[PDB]
Amino acid sequence: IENSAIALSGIVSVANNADNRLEVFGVSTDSAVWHNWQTAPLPNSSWAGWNKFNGVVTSKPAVHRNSDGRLEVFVRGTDNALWHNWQTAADTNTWSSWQPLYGGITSNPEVCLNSDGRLEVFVRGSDNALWHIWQTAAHTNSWSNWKSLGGTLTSNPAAHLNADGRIEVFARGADNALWHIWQTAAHTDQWSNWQSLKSVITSDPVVINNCDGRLEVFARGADSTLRHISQIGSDSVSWSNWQCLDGVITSAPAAVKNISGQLEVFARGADNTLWRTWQTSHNGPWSNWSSFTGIIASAPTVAKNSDGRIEVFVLGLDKALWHLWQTTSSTTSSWTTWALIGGITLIDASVILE
Amino acid sequence: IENSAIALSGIVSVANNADNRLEVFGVSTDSAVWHNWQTAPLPNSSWAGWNKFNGVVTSKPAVHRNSDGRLEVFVRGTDNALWHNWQTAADTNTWSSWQPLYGGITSNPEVCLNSDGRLEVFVRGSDNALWHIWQTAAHTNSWSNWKSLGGTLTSNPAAHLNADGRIEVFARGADNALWHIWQTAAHTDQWSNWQSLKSVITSDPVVINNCDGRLEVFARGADSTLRHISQIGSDSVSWSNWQCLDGVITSAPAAVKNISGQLEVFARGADNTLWRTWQTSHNGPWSNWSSFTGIIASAPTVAKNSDGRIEVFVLGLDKALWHLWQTTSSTTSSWTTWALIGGITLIDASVILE
Amino acid sequence: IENSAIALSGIVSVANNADNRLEVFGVSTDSAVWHNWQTAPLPNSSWAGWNKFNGVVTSKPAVHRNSDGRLEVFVRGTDNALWHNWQTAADTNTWSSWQPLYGGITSNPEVCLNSDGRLEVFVRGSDNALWHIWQTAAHTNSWSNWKSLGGTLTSNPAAHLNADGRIEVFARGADNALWHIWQTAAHTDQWSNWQSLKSVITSDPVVINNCDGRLEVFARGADSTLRHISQIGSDSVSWSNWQCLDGVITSAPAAVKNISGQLEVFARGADNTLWRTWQTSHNGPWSNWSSFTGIIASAPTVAKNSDGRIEVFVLGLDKALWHLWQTTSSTTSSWTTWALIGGITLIDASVILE
Amino acid sequence: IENSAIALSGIVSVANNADNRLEVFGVSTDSAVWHNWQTAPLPNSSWAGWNKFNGVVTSKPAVHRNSDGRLEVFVRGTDNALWHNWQTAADTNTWSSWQPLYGGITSNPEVCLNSDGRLEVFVRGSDNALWHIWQTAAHTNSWSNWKSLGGTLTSNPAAHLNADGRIEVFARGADNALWHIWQTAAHTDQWSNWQSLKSVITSDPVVINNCDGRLEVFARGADSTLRHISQIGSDSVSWSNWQCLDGVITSAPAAVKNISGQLEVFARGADNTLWRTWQTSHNGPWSNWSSFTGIIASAPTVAKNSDGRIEVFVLGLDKALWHLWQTTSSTTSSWTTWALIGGITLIDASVILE
């Protein structure tokens, strides 16, 4: 791999509904977004079947739950502008049509919830800068104008809340390094300058919060292995050194915090199967990678069920969505084998960033 | 103090709205519930002023946020039945009237959200058993019939989710010990038998989850000091031994998890001022108690703002509500002095359990 | 129990030799010190048999290993002065006669090794102050004059190194509180003033260092339960609050750090059997007490073998020494039942402090 | 660098005496071992001056403290056999001549103390296997015959005790991977087979024990950065995955456990200055590397003083030994600048393993 590579992305975006049922969003061969969901938040739930949103799209969709429980999806349209749709009532299959947010978008959209309930969307714009737009009232269709945060992006953005409620955004720069920018006051339009975390990355960055309130960032490195970095915390503006983990990965990573508070990461491995690693103690060292049977054709998308069980979604060799999951809430639970969520086939609609 | 004492309770119940503004509920000298709120989730926010719900009540109110962001309050009526009211839209001051849930209630109500979005209410009933009632569909006015969980209660109940989504309820028994009972499958009507945690307690129990997914229970003991106990976790059904902390307390305790992941506890101390203790490291030992200036007339009620700042509410010597808070999100932040939230005076409406 | 009680002490002092064999020292019905040892540092070792030191004594003996591996024992004589004897070669049963260190002693002696290799002995003196005496050259028979550290003692002293090499001494005061005093520079005659840790104690204090370099003190409290306190560390001069653990104990406690870095405490319980508690996680909560079969007649004395296995010594109902131990180095190892180390019977020679 | 490289070694071996004074051993331009020491275990101690052992040698010397406090040095002679010398009394400058242990040695010697007090020496032999020899009685000149442990070595060996008293040896193999072999019972001639930890290394391995009883191994990797691996512990035979830390190093690393229980590592960096990294929390992430002023000409050798202060020794550009140290015991202590321990110049006598 070249320093400017961007590892294969996940094939769906996933959210928990207000009642914690999982719901997935992808793009089919008709270039429309389709979605599917658990019919109940139970370990044996059926899935509803694939349902289409009318309209042709031109990015991977991004979904988030509003602070009033309603899911809302963001996507680039055929006009290269940002569009969104939403549940009109929480937990209900009554959706808006696609509605315009305008702009000129040159990445997949990334959505985050501010600590005051307002959704915020981050994209690369027509000038390769980071641009953003936000709800001006929590869980309302009153959106700001577009505003630039500058920079020069070469990955999709990844956004996450700090423990103190400040959004922080991570994106690869023109030097192939990881850069980041943050709100300097929680849920306010007061932002830092861009700063570099150094290190070349070859995937989009993925971010999660630890127990202790420290963000941790994962990405593939120049040598095609997973690497990670974390905030020092305790009111320091600093970050740790980077660490790599042995094992060549061949997709973006996906991180999750298990219900014991430990981090886990999933990624497609060198043999094209799903790999998993976990922290073996608090803050710990990391386990050797463990493999699940079966060749997969995307990065994993990882979620947690109502009961904490971890569930993983991937593109199969049949171009359909498959999943596996923990059979119990235990961190030592056994896992299922891949099962098909059939009814459509999927395409990787991610925006080709070059 | 006698083994059967129940330490002075908090004077309000508090919730975060969908947009994370704090909102408080208490009972005035007209025996009606009144509420007040931050007008914005900011460190300098004004408060709206006290607003009345019409209707006479006969318990402390309990508030929870639905899974669709709407606040909902539970209280005993003049008929000794359970009543509830709610926001008809998240973040909005449009409330239902008090609506009936019936029953015969002999404690304050305790409300919890299941891991599938459904509210559930626990009370002591006419026979001194634990009784419960629940939404049958998340965030809907479709409620179950009343059902008994048995037992013999001598405190108000305290309910909390386990990390795996099972509700667990704690209440003092006929022997003045702490007892508990739990869902054996997440968000299902499948419950354990009652089991004893031994130890005499002289307050209602207070429960919180740690980072690591272990519940921790706090209560005043027979010697009038704070004591605590925690789940061993890692798939064990066991709990630790009890520990007491030196320092005589004269109210119920209130616990919070700070945005660094450490536990803190607040309680009125032996000198009738607010005391605070914190874990000094991960799982740690606990700090000596620290005092805030000012004689207080209830237990503290503790909450976190949108940005993580901890805020504490108490009854003053003027019979009004006062608060203080961290001025920044830092775990070493300074604190304000008591400030008045004026406009009404409050009574302790808690049900007299004897 | 009265606040001025001092819980029953251990019946032997124990050390590891230079080759890590365990060796025990007690006083028989002839009022002489006798000793016994493992013949090899193995899980199945025989014990050598009891060997007498000639001479009548009037305290419990205290043993320490010199920095050149030789064991050295300290005891009060019939003249109320301090005496000592030593191995003349490490691991060898060639001992000096009892040799005089003079003084006037009114407690058992307590011995510690400074971080520069010099033994130091602490006693209560004729005036009830803490007095001390030390090697002036490591592992040599060149001893200082006696020097007073002042105070007013009502327990035997307990001494331990801080992580930074400063000796710290703990002893109950005239108010029945725990007090302490320390070197302010490592292995130097530069000492603090006495300071109080407050809390009444009803045993001698017992001290151990944690992994993280923080001292932790254990003692029985006024309510006859175990209590503990620890340094906050990270360059703070402070200590935590005290915590008690439920369960009435009827001897002094004995603490050990297991080879996983967690603390364990042993004590005779309310039913006169040996009880054990352990930290269940790092810094953790503490386990419920677990009991071993058999009524015992002293506090436990606890040690670790060459391989980390924990071993416990007690006075039996036959007035002889018994022991039990972990059968493997695992922190989940099984334990033996009491086994007799026969050949003599023992008396409690501890100085009657009143 | 090539996979078969072995990074520049430290220029001295160091030990603490029985009284904890530091003492260093190196080889001068006369091909003899010389030594120097602190005259007192104090922060301002003078050093004694360089003292010669007569006799020409052909490896780096290795020093250890016996279980009776006497230092003992091991070196290869002009006959390619192993020789040793020792203090005849602890803390005293009365040394034996070089005495023969025979053998045929093709690496530097590595010495470890068993958990029963017996020294043990590990070398690569004439057949490239690991060979060993040991005291048969603790701290005595009664040595075993030579015995082979097999394997094929391409680095010097590194030995360390497990928490349970079993010696474990680490060495690079014929595939340039890290391999290891261990006692299966503490301080017994019962050994495992060789097993591979995989990963190519380009230095000798360096091993330390954590607080929690888990060994951790450090080495330079194929990409010239530091990497590390640790035991999972809790009775597992497993190890973690490898992690690398960013930053190119140009010597072997040296690890230390600070008196707060956290690990630190020192190494010459890419700019030929001394670099340091530390764990920022328990088990933590690792800090960015920090540099000390001054170009150095060996790996660092790191030690701790009687009071815990960390001290580092290096070859200077003048071919003499220099050191720097923490001025206080605090983990946030300031550090001195390089100071010269003058009187001789040193050579790197390490055995050329190719």
Side-chain angles (χ1 to χ4, degrees), chain B residues 78 126 146 156 163 234 318 320:
Chain B
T78 57
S126 64
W146 284 93
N156 300 293
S234 290
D318 64 356

Side-chain angles (χ1 to χ4, degrees), chain A residues 10-235:
Chain A
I11 207 58
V12 288
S13 179
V14 57
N16 295 269
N17 274 276
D19 65 12
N20 270 333
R21 289 175 304 94
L22 295 177
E23 184 159 349
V24 300
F25 300 81
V27 181
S28 191
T29 57
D30 60 5
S31 297
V33 177
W34 294 70
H35 67 311
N36 204 331
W37 52 96
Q38 291 170 332
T39 60
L42 287 171
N44 65 341
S45 188
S46 68
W47 287 59
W50 292 98
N51 285 241
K52 185 172 69 171
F53 299 138
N54 291 328
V56 175
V57 303
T58 66
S59 72
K60 185 180 182 179
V63 59
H64 210 98
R65 187 183 60 200
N66 277 273
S67 59
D68 66 3
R70 293 177 303 91
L71 298 187
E72 184 158 351
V73 181
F74 298 85
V75 76
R76 191 177 68 169
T78 57
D79 58 5
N80 288 331
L82 183 62
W83 296 75
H84 66 324
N85 71 5
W86 51 91
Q87 291 171 330
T88 63
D91 298 306
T92 302
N93 192 25
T94 297
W95 287 71
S96 72
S97 49
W98 293 116
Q99 297 284 314
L101 283 169
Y102 305 98
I105 308 308
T106 64
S107 70
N108 293 331
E110 169 69 349
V111 58
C112 197
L113 197 44
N114 277 276
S115 50
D116 68 357
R118 295 179 301 93
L119 292 177
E120 185 158 352
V121 181
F122 296 94
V123 301
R124 193 176 69 176
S126 64
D127 59 3
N128 295 317
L130 181 65
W131 290 77
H132 66 322
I133 195 177
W134 51 89
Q135 290 173 332
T136 63
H139 56 74
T140 304
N141 197 28
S142 294
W143 289 73
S144 69
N145 290 333
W146 284 93
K147 194 161 172 181
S148 179
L149 283 165
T152 304
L153 277 59
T154 65
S155 73
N156 300 293
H160 204 94
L161 282 172
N162 283 271
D164 67 1
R166 297 174 302 94
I167 292 178
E168 186 157 356
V169 186
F170 298 83
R172 196 173 72 180
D175 58 3
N176 295 132
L178 183 58
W179 296 65
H180 64 323
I181 194 174
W182 50 95
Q183 290 172 342
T184 58
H187 63 73
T188 293
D189 189 23
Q190 293 182 168
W191 289 76
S192 78
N193 290 133
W194 281 100
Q195 291 189 200
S196 182
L197 292 169
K198 321 291 175 139
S199 198
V200 166
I201 64 169
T202 63
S203 72
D204 293 329
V206 176
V207 49
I208 192 161
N209 56 301
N210 284 277
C211 278
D212 66 5
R214 299 167 309 105
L215 293 183
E216 187 142 4
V217 179
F218 298 88
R220 192 175 70 178
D223 71 359
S224 205
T225 66
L226 182 66
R227 49 171 47 241
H228 71 291
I229 190 178
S230 60
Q231 283 177 332
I232 293 311
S234 290
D235 285 282

